[PDB]
Ligand binder design. Structure first.
Ligand code: HEM
Ligand code: HEM
Ligand SMILES: *Cc1c(COP(=O)(O)O)cnc(C)c1O
Ligand SMILES: *Cc1c(COP(=O)(O)O)cnc(C)c1O
Lengths: 491, 493
């Protein structure tokens, strides 16, 4: 069992000529008209300007974002995943058909599983139980085997993702742990490609770089190349509360687990070089999710939580900067991984990140009863179509809920939809109503708030106002709510 | 005031007319600058990637190419028509700053419009069918769009249709516009001006067949017109889901079903922007093919694409059979998996909708149909949450055990504790020997019956590290993935 946190043997120091390096470096290559495979769609990520958030927090500087979620697997990890594989293949260590085992937060696991799916390697991912199910669905779709570990497990312990990875490797023939925590290919990928891209996109002019830290490879490779080729740039590292990566140690004193995925650790990875980070900042979950949501709402960037942590620090750290200067921020991954988490309001409420006291209009806190409802006529599912047309027209009604003999509501039926279906030949007048019933709806009480109705209308067209039996006091749609509000506008 | 989406087109284009005769304003593709002023500039210039396995699996002799449109900022092909429709409107003077934009949609156009709206400062109201995925709703809600739903089976003629509701909303809201993807020229024109140029440039002009799934029809129309002009020999193949009426000849459209699970393609009316005259041949697709093939695209080619992409490739492996070596077939891949994370990507959904037969287990190894009891379980010693750490260390060492489930005085299982985690926590000073075990407890686990299959266990281990074997109260044993591995490998020798 090799320790992920072993002190680095690298003899790099600022000032050493690049010629002195023992490592194999790879030049970035121009993308061909047609891509031989998707793995070539890694790198050359866009550098987009942040237009609102910085000014909202008083930055005078240009704030730029390196959007890494445009990589083929959707994360910054797709970079090292490729590199680590390719170098291994050149080492002769990785043979065709071989098994790759990797401890991960998920994104490296996705990149590796992707490359494995393409290049024909077996892939076993070992990730903590905290990480999102979306990553699991993706990994499962890529054909990767999945193993989980308890979140709070110490890295020293056998139950940790690293430990489980090694224990798996020992039992499986032709298996390798590329080990992102130790492999040089990880920071070197960012030293060779990512930093070059940043330097090229910025024309060499660059005042500050903010990056969240996990394995530390991104900030390490980028900071090393930046210290060499753009010495004045300040390197700002971001570490979650509960993590120990940050310096000075006094900052780390604190919670031990946190909701944000992909950053922070209970050990210092070998690839990480804390010497090149000029200053550290601590971040928390609330900041992270708040800012990520802000990134989406304001800048249109569909990025994940670490991106939010990063920007949340950047609006603080960049205050010292002034006009004409620029701050670049790394945005490690997409919202795809967190669709049911921070993107979801219910999860944010459930986790206590969103207080209910959720910016709303005057009508939000009003009861539905004030809408001016009218109780509709009810019909059986077994009633026939033309008959319903006659009933509805004869009473001047345009729609009727479909309720069972036992009084359970089955759905909704409309005059216009019926005429349309009949005129089109889709159904017969003698045909049963079930052929054209709108089966989907949601129920509400007279004492429900209008805003609750507004949330309900984002999933359903119809909302039936009902008693506690077969009793529909009224039917409300978005158009009705609109009509009420708009009528109230006229006064 | 209700304009029909299915009104016959007024366009007087016909193959052979000089481009100079066109009344429309055309936009040239531009080189992307080093730094993007905003994310909307990250639309277009989508990669053309080669399919390496699937075509050969189905006996294609030709080069199969994919125009991967899911790399657009909003994640779909619709981001193109969203930008264009807006920009043109802004040039028309029709769209004013701060104005409200209402749009009927399957979602992707709505996401692109909501994105652009969020950037450019428009109010955005999306009207989409109840069938469409919750993921789209979550994204639209995050982008700040107001959202309204309509019944899936509502006829387009009916007041309850997304089109009809969109118009009805428009009539009640001042300073509101419906850009209308179903009628607006900016939709197909966006594909004629940009997407098609990209395909032509990426293919160096050489292109034998193009397969595209159809929705509003703007993609296939805009691409096919320019292709018919600049690459006449290329065949245009359209994909239409069963239950839809877009396909020709009408004989193909005859079907029992009217709704289908696949999102973004097919309609109960012929959109004005669609030009069926340029479609050389149509193919009908179903949900099973679509999802199977989408999953195949992910599993084999590493392309994280949605269901319409699956429909398209599923057609392509049929339609391209006539092609031979040296010829190439280009396929459109409209959107990403992000919209379908909890649908076809999710195995439980595929089971629930009946797309996945359980039998097709058959893919699985020998040990899959074996009971958990055969693992060689041993019942562990349990401890109270309230027991202290060093005490437990002593008990476990004295018994030769390495771990103990933590069960309540009431006998509810609270979790798990391992000797190694305790020792590690102690040596690090995180905890004291006199400290409560609950400071170090592994709270998360899953239960299983002794009669459960090993494969079920294998599914469980993808969400939890520990699986407790239990009766109805009592823990017969603790199993991890390593234990399953040791068992299988042991039986293997
Ligand atoms: C002049 C430049 C450099 C020199 C001369 C150098 C030298 C070395 C040497 C000799 C080792 C192996 C030591 C041993 O195992 O005995 C090493 C390891 C390593 N290097 Fe470098 N290095 C340079 C730059 C870099 C850069 C720029 C990066 C990343 C951005 C990097 C990342 C690593 C990593 C991650 C290891 C593994 C450490 C370990 O296994 O303990 N190196 N380097
Ligand atoms: C020489 C080329 C073309 C000419 C002369 C032409 C002419 C026209 C004219 C005159 C109209 C409006 C008729 C009216 O409102 O009175 C029109 C509408 C339209 N055009 Fe074109 N067009 C050309 C090419 C195209 C192309 C290449 C596309 C898309 C790929 C296109 C898409 C549309 C659409 C969607 C409409 C709306 C139809 C309607 O309003 O009912 N046109 N075109
Ligand atoms: C890995 C990862 C990081 C951190 O990158 P390092 O290069 O490991 O610092 C941040 N965010 C996400 C989502 C990640 O997966
Ligand atoms: C819109 C859409 C299509 C079809 O595009 P048209 O250009 O409308 O034919 C296919 N798939 C998805 C996901 C879509 O959103």
């Amino acid at each position: 069992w090799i320790r992920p946190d072993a002190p680095s043997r690298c003899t790099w120091q600022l000032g050493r000529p690049a010629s002195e390096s023992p490592h194999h470096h790879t030049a970035p290559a121009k993308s061909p008209k047609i891509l031989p495979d998707i793995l070539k769609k890694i790198g050359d990520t866009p550098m987009v300007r942040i237009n609102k958030i910085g000014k909202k927090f008083g930055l005078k500087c240009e704030l730029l974002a390196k959007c890494e979620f445009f990589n083929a697997g959707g994360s910054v990890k797709d970079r090292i995943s490729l590199r680590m594989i390719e170098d291994a293949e050149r080492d002769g260590t990785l043979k065709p058909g071989d098994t790759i085992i990797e401890p991960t937060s998920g994104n490296t696991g996705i990149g590796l599983a992707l490359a494995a799916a393409v290049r024909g390697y077996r892939c076993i991912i070992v990730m903590p139980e905290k990480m999102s199910s979306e990553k699991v669905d993706v990994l499962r779709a890529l054909g990767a085997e999945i193993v989980r570990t308890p979140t709070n497990a110490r890295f020293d312990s056998p139950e940790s993702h690293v430990g489980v990875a090694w224990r798996l490797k020992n039992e499986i023939p032709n298996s390798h742990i590329l080990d992102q925590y130790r492999n040089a290919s990880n920071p070197l990928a960012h030293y060779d490609t990512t930093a070059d891209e940043i330097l090229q996109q910025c024309d060499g002019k660059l005042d500050m770089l903010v990056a969240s830290v996990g394995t530390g490879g991104t900030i390490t490779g980028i900071a090393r190349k930046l210290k060499e080729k753009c010495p004045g740039c300040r390197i700002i590292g971001v570490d979650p509360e509960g993590s120990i990566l940050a310096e000075p140690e006094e900052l780390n004193q604190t919670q031990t687990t946190y909701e944000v995925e992909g950053i922070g650790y209970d050990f210092i990875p070998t690839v990480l070089d804390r010497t090149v980070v000029d200053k550290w900042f601590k971040s928390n979950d609330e900041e992270a999710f708040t800012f990520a949501r802000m990134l989406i709402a304001q800048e249109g960037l569909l990025c994940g939580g670490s991106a939010g942590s990063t920007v949340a620090v950047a609006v603080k750290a960049a205050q010292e900067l002034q006009e004409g200067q620029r701050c670049v921020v790394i945005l490690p991954d997409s919202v795809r991984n967190y669709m049911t988490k921070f993107l979801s309001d219910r999860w944010m409420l459930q986790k206590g990140f969103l207080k209910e006291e959720l910016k709303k209009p005057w009508w939000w806190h009003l009861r539905v009863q004030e809408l001016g409802l009218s109780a509709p006529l009810t019909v059986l599912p077994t009633i026939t179509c033309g008959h319903t047309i006659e009933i509805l027209r004869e009473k001047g009604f345009n729609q009727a809920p479909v309720v069972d003999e036992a009084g359970v509501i089955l759905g909704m039926v409309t005059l216009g939809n019926m005429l349309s279906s009949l005129l089109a030949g889709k159904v017969q007048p003698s045909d049963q109503v079930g052929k054209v019933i709108y089966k989907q709806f949601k129920q509400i009480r007279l004492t429900d708030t209008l805003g609750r109705l507004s949330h309900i209308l984002e999933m359903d067209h119809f909302a039936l106002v009902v008693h506690e039996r077969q009793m529909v006091f009224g039917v409300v749609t978005a158009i009705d709510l609109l009509n009420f509000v708009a009528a109230q506008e006229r006064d």
